[PDB]
Design a protein around this ligand. Sequence first.
Ligand SMILES: [Fe+3]
Ligand SMILES: [Fe+3]
Ligand SMILES: [Fe+3]
Length: 308
Amino acid sequence: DITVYNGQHKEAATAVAKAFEQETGIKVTLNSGKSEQLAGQLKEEGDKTPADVFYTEQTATFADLSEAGLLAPISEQTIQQTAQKGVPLAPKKDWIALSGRSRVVVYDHTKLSEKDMEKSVLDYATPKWKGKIGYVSTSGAFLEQVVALSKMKGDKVALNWLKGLKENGKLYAKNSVALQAVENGEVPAALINNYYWYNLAKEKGVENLKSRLYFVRHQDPGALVSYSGAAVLKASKNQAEAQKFVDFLASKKGQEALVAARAEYPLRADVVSPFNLEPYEKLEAPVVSATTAQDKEHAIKLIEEAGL
Ligand SMILES: [Fe+3]
Ligand SMILES: [Fe+3]
Ligand SMILES: [Fe+3]
């Protein structure tokens, strides 16, 4: 039996653990919390940690644990199961990316079509979109989008986009609220993440929704994907079962369990999502370094400077 420190949505972690317990008869205990807190906890606990595996919604969390000497190596055959082009790889082969969440533009297809969409996420912050684009500045993925713009295009561009959103956009408290505002006609488009929309479609039926998604693709900064993953702790004295679990998460079965539970993109090429997601490779995500705590502080500074 193993202990998994879990920064992922509880429904995802519960599903894969259950599927694993059913496939192997090995029991999984979840300890759930915020990935950054769990990573600090793993650092402080050190050799004495009870965690066998760290399962996170954000692979960026692994860099600091790897450099601290806290992660075990995983099988290269396992790493290769999800190593599609563009998927982040651990240089020390001591964690693996398993699934992804995408930035997207949601639009009311009763008012707009693809003719009205933009080639670049930058172009939504422009006067064409005054009072017509919703955004969620408090959102973690909004903050990852800002980090990506800084990285890909520089701070001037990033700041200018934020000022453009201040001037032209409608601020919503959360992604679900933005999505509802588009469905309800308050605003004709909004910047959100994919799974909100696919959750609502699965639940209500797409034919009954007024909104649709637009993917910018071509490695635009607005095609940003955030990656979930897993690592074995070097401190574990149950390496065999920890390793068996991380192998399971990369298996067809483990990926199928995840995608049934949550509308994340599987990183195995032979798994479909019942949420009707496109294949990961079609997203054309840009390649962006992992977010650091310094990157996040910097992005928060730009958001403040833009009056947001
Ligand atoms: Fe959430
Ligand atoms: Fe949310
Ligand atoms: Fe969210």
